[PDB]
Design a protein around this ligand. Structure first.
Ligand SMILES: CO[C@@H]1O[C@H](CO)[C@@H](O[C@@H]2O[C@H](CO)[C@H](O)[C@H](O)[C@H]2O)[C@H](O[C@@H]2O[C@@H](C)[C@@H](O)[C@@H](O)[C@@H]2O)[C@H]1NC(C)=O
Length: 218
């Protein structure tokens, strides 16, 4: 079978400038009839893949001329002109010169927007979770860029790393920001043995961490 190779990540692209997604095939995709059997699909965050370009030079319905594909029989690039925030997602190349259809690994397009610092919220366990015996503490960091960010938990002044897990959203379709939750998972019993709960978010927008704290007994 034919192998389609593409890089997982792109250089972050500025709104209004040009993005390029590369793809290469293990065999030429140019058939003796003059058609190159290359396709481009876009998978947007939370959605199924959808066709952008078919057989190199055809624009799928409702796709603007901003998208264009060119290349040889083996080396291809998708060009996206005047990229908009809603262009974010994973771009897949594909071939059906031969059976079976095969797909590249996908390349994520990232929007390079101006840095933005996170808005930080801390959430003590609710009475409902406590009734269940659980005491997850959540620190939410909302609408920041770029994606890389560090959260530190302090419990009564001592750093806590065990039981802490971080998870991000995808880049937002409109404001091109990320959000992430840091969750400290504790039992009610563990939770009720300390008073002060702090999360500290370190991001490149500042040298000072943004710090949120609460006291369990308030
Ligand atoms: C080995 O030949 C290729 O086989 C693939 C998979 O069967 C064909 O793709 C399917 O074609 C049928 C129609 O024959 C339907 O369109 C399916 O949805 C396709 O998955 C290749 O056929 C080419 O590509 C299709 C999208 C059509 O445009 C078709 O006319 C083309 O020939 C077929 N490719 C070649 C080089 O023969």
């Amino acid at each position: 079978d034919i192998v389609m190779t593409q890089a997982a990540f792109s250089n972050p692209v500025t709104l209004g400038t040009s993005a390029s997604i590369s793809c290469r095939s293990s065999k030429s995709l140019l058939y003796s009839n003059g058609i190159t059997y290359l396709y481009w699909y876009l998978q947007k965050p939370g959605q199924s893949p959808q066709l952008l370009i078919y057989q190199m030079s055809n624009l799928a319905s409702g796709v603007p001329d901003r998208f264009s594909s060119s290349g040889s029989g083996t080396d291809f690039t998708l060009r996206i002109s005047r990229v908009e925030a809603e262009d974010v997602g994973v771009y897949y190349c594909a071939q059906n010169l031969e059976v079976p259809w095969t797909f590249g690994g996908g390349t994520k397009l990232e929007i390079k927007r101006a840095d933005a610092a996170p808005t930080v919220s801390i959430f003590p366990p609710s009475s409902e979770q406590l009734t269940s015996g659980g005491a997850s503490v959540v620190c939410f960091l909302n609408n920041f860029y770029p994606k890389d960010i560090n959260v530190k938990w302090k419990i009564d002044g001592s750093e806590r790393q065990n039981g802490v897990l971080n998870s991000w959203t995808d880049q937002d379709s409109k404001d091109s920001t990320y959000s992430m939750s840091s969750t400290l998972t504790l039992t009610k019993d563990e939770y009720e043995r300390h008073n002060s709960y702090t999360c500290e978010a370190t991001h490149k927008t500042s040298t000072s961490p943004i710090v949120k704290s609460f006291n369990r007994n308030e």
